[PDB]
Amino acid sequence: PSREALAVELSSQQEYLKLKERYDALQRTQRNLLGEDLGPLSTKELESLERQLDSSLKQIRALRTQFMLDQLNDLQSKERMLTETNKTLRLRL
């Protein structure tokens, strides 16, 4: 190979080890949410995680409920438009 070619290849290995460290740290935080590898956490950290996860669970349930209600309102609107569109049977006369 070449010297300048080694420096460019090893430079990529440097930014990969910067990204792998960022990925590993993200995967650590992700194991905690999901309730895994909880041992290293202090009872204060463990309490903070619980409050975060439950606030998050309350948000998502409220969102799934609102999303279902919005879908129901959208279908009733479509029904009213399809019925009043059907009533144009008045053309077929």
Cβ neighbours of 47 (radius 10 Å)? 11
Cα–Cα distance, 6 to 12 (Å, whole number): 10
- Residues in 38-57 that interact with a second copy by CB under 8 A: 38, 43, 46-47, 49-50, 52-57
Q: Is residue 46 within 8 Å of residue 33, measured between CB atoms?
A: no
Tokens in use for 42?
Answer: 């202090």
Q: Is residue 35 within 8 Å of residue 52, measured between CB atoms?
A: no
Task: Answer yes or no whether residue 4 interacts with a second copy by CB under 8 A.
Answer: no
# residues near a second copy by CB under 8 A: 54
Task: Answer yes or no whether residue 37 interacts with a second copy by CB under 8 A.
Answer: no
Positions in the binding site for a second copy (CB under 8 A): 9, 12-13, 15-16, 19-20, 22-23, 26-27, 29-30, 33-36, 38, 43, 46-47, 49-50, 52-61, 63-65, 67-69, 71-72, 75-76, 78-79, 82-83, 85-86, 88-89, 91-93
